[PDB]
Design a protein around this ligand. Sequence first.
Ligand SMILES: Oc1cc(O)c2c(c1)O[C@H](c1ccc(O)c(O)c1)[C@@H](O)C2
Length: 161
Amino acid sequence: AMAGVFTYESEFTSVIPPPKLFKAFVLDADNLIPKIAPQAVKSAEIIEGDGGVGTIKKIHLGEGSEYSYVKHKIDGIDKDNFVYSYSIIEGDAIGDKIEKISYEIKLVASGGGSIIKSTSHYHTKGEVEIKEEHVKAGKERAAGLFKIIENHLLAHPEEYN
Ligand SMILES: Oc1cc(O)c2c(c1)O[C@H](c1ccc(O)c(O)c1)[C@@H](O)C2
């Protein structure tokens, strides 16, 4: 029956500045990734909402994740300060051990690069197993994807200006 929340903090740098990165990784992620990283993600669609806060999206994952869905709940967007927060509410790692996973992502200017500050909140249930390796994975995973994006924009500077 026991509820809890485990909360983890992570950072990535990028040479791409916030406002470009933001448009690519947040605002256009849904079409972009599927185009440049099919193994990551096949497609993404709005199930519910108006696209703003409170929208839910079914995201169709790629082979990397045995073609499994997740549903994302948009918790907030601030297009000015480059903040985005969304919770995974169904899908891959959302079992019994763990019931929602929530992210706040904050892009910070840093020398015409960015630092991507990421807070994740694993909403637990029952006993709490959290392995230094389960965290390293999920972290590598996210960074793998920012790297795909960063390198994509470096090779396509015509995009997201
Ligand atoms: O290989 C994977 C496995 C996953 O569970 C996920 C992956 C990639 O990336 C998905 C992802 C992450 C950020 C996104 O904007 C996105 O559209 C899709 C993430 O929610 C879940």
